Amino acid sequence: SEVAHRFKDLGEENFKALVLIAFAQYLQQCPFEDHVKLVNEVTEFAKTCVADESAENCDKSLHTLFGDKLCTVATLRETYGEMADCCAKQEPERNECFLQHKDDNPNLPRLVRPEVDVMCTAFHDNEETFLKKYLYEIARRHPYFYAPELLFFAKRYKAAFTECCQAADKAACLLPKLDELRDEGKASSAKQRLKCASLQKFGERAFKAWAVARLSQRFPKAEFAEVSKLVTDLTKVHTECCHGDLLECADDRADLAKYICENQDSISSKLKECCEKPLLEKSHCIAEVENDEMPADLPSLAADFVESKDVCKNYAEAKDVFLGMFLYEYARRHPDYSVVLLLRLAKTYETTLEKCCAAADPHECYAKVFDEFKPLVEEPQNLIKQNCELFEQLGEYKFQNALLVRYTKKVPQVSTPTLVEVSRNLGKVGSKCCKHPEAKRMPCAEDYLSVVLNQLCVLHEKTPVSDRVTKCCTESLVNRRPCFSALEVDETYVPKEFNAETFTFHADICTLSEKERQIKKQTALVELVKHKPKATKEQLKAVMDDFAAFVEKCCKADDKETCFAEEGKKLVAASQAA
Ligand SMILES: CCCC1C(=O)N2C(N(C)C)=Nc3ccc(C)cc3N2C1=O
Ligand SMILES: CCCC1C(=O)N2C(N(C)C)=Nc3ccc(C)cc3N2C1=O
């Protein structure tokens, strides 16, 4: 039995949660209730298997079990149409079908939160249900949310209410901590989406490379044989969490933290504090631990990678181990380099050894490789230096508008909402990284841009409308950013035509939070640039300044909401003029 296997390892609490998240992440539309039912029916079954390890079907694979349980409600196409397909299939045909149907943008209603008085009541009255509802709302909206980590956010979430509800002003104590959590989880969720896209779209070799370079930066003192050990396991973990095998992912993830803490001295000296706490907190700590100090006397890379005469021979013997080593070596001494640049260099090196080693005199040929790294290294530095300057001058909001105009011009076919979210996140790189010293700027900026551009790539993959987004997203994982930065304006885009339904206005806007207004303002700017690409940042600007005036005004006018009827036709006259 496997269900029994995992149960004993995780226990009732975690086992019950993971299965909830797994169910929530598969049938994102189904109601909380039904998920709970199935979870319990599933948990009960497990309990018997523990005793009699051959009872009913305790001999199967989680999937068959999990799959059939969901198929007791999925067959309801009237609710989940395209799902019935999946159930008519059989493992593994069935499982893939489910994974392939997860929605990165569910049509789930916004999740507003009741007043502090209700939450604390509901929390206090019934706890487990309160926290179950939390996991369900997160897992269903983030189908790739790294499960093990979601449990950590949960324990954290619980402590928020557990303390704040006993305050002198709950609202004051809760709100903050709740906000800080909503953000941090959106970040977690995106870093994870990239890892799964990598594994799924590009293959484990690509993820392995990513990991080697990332881990080598974090643990410079660790050894190549050691890192590789870690890279092998870590890859398996994610591979499981990204294929929907949550229980094993969680299990293996625990075993990995166990190992890493045991062999502490062999890996990093900054792990101590991590290994002295509860599992869930232990794991989250290791994954976020700062890099260890760099080993003192380190030889020059040129030694064994460009000057040695045995280069090509070693490359031929174990090209993967050789390139593996080159990356580990270059990464361990460059924590000031974003992981994607390290991978670009590694690819530039591989390409060179390929053409060079089949030459009349390899050495002569590959002797100047580092001369090419110079451009690759400076491109990002200059880009960051430039973009943080602009940011510092315009502030976040204005900087995001800039990126909005700029991207809409690159890929005008992309849907306005997607362009708005992505440009807003791209501009958050300013506040997130520009306040760093150049030594830490690049890894912060350029790797964060990979996570943001991946969203666009996955949101776009649902309904592809721009081959330029497809080219840049599918050509090379590591070069995505460089690809997009090269795009200028689409010369073949045929401008749109002003609609009435292209953009509705109904006064309902004067009630929305401040943020939700800039957003409505930004959504406008996008639609503008699509209707007038060839327009300039001069006109556009002056115009944006106008719209601000319209809202600030009419939202303070006492006529029936017809000040838009009259002034709405008024602005239209001005707009067409520009
Ligand atoms: C639009 C954002 C609404 C929103 C929100 O408030 N959330 C929240 N709460 C309830 C604190 N915690 C989260 C933690 C991690 C993630 C990924 C998402 C949320 N979650 C949301 O999606
Ligand atoms: C960027 C950090 C590199 C990195 C790292 O050290 N990780 C790790 N261990 C314990 C090796 N376990 C994980 C668990 C959860 C998350 C979200 C990420 C990791 N994983 C990484 O992605």
Curated annotation (Swiss-Prot):
Belongs to the ALB/AFP/VDB family. GO terms for molecular function: antioxidant activity; copper ion binding; DNA binding; enterobactin binding; exogenous protein binding; fatty acid binding; identical protein binding; protein-folding chaperone binding. Gene3D superfamilies: 1.10.246.10. Changing C173F: In Hawkes bay. The record marks K195 as: Aspirin-acetylated lysine. The modification N6-methyllysine is found at K530. One of its GO terms (biological process) is cellular response to starvation. Binds water, Ca(2+), Na(+), K(+), fatty acids, hormones, bilirubin and drugs. Its main function is the regulation of the colloidal osmotic pressure of blood. Major zinc transporter in plasma, typically binds about 80% of all plasma zinc. Major calcium and magnesium transporter in plasma, binds approximately 45% of circulating calcium and magnesium in plasma. Potentially has more than two calcium-binding sites and might additionally bind calcium in a non-specific manner. One of its GO terms (cellular component) is extracellular space. Interacts with FCGRT; this interaction regulates ALB homeostasis. Interacts with TASOR. In plasma, occurs in a covalently-linked complex with chromophore-bound alpha-1-microglobulin with molar ratio 1:2 and 1:1; this interaction does not prevent fatty acid binding to ALB. Disulfide bonds join C49-C58, C71-C87, C86-C97, C120-C165, C164-C173, C196-C242, C241-C249, C261-C275, C274-C285, C312-C357, C356-C365, C388-C434, C433-C444, C457-C473, C472-C483, C510-C555, C554-C563. Ca(2+) 1 binds at E2, E240, D245, E248. SUPFAM superfamilies: Serum albumin-like (SSF48552). It is found in: Secreted. It is linked to Hyperthyroxinemia, familial dysalbuminemic: A disorder characterized by abnormally elevated levels of total serum thyroxine (T4) in euthyroid patients. It is due to abnormal serum albumin that binds T4 with enhanced affinity. Analbuminemia: A rare autosomal recessive disorder manifested by the presence of a very low amount of circulating serum albumin. Affected individuals manifest mild edema, hypotension, fatigue, and, occasionally, lower body lipodystrophy (mainly in adult females). The most common biochemical finding is hyperlipidemia, with a significant increase in the total and LDL cholesterol concentrations, but normal concentrations of HDL cholesterol and triglycerides. Changing K532E: In Castel di Sangro. Changing E350K: In Hiroshima-1. Glycated in diabetic patients. Phosphorylated by FAM20C in the extracellular medium. Residues 1-182, 183-375, 376-573 form the Albumin domain. InterPro entries: ALB/AFP/VDB, Serum_albumin-like, Serum_albumin/AFP/Afamin, Serum_albumin_CS, Serum_albumin_N. The modification Phosphoserine is found at S1, S54, S61, S269, S415, S485. Glycans are attached at residues 8, 47, 133, 158, 195, 221, 229, 272, 277, 309, 313-314, 319, 347, 374, 409, 435, 440, 490, 521, 530, 532, 541, 569. This is Albumin. The record marks 16, 37, 60, 69, 89, 102, 132, 155, 170, 177, 186, 191, 201, 208, 236, 258, 270, 282, 355, 368, 385, 398, 410, 428, 432, 462, 471, 496, 515, 520, 534, 537, 553, 556, 560, 570 as: Not glycated. It comes from Homo sapiens (Human). The modification Phosphothreonine is found at T79, T416, T418.
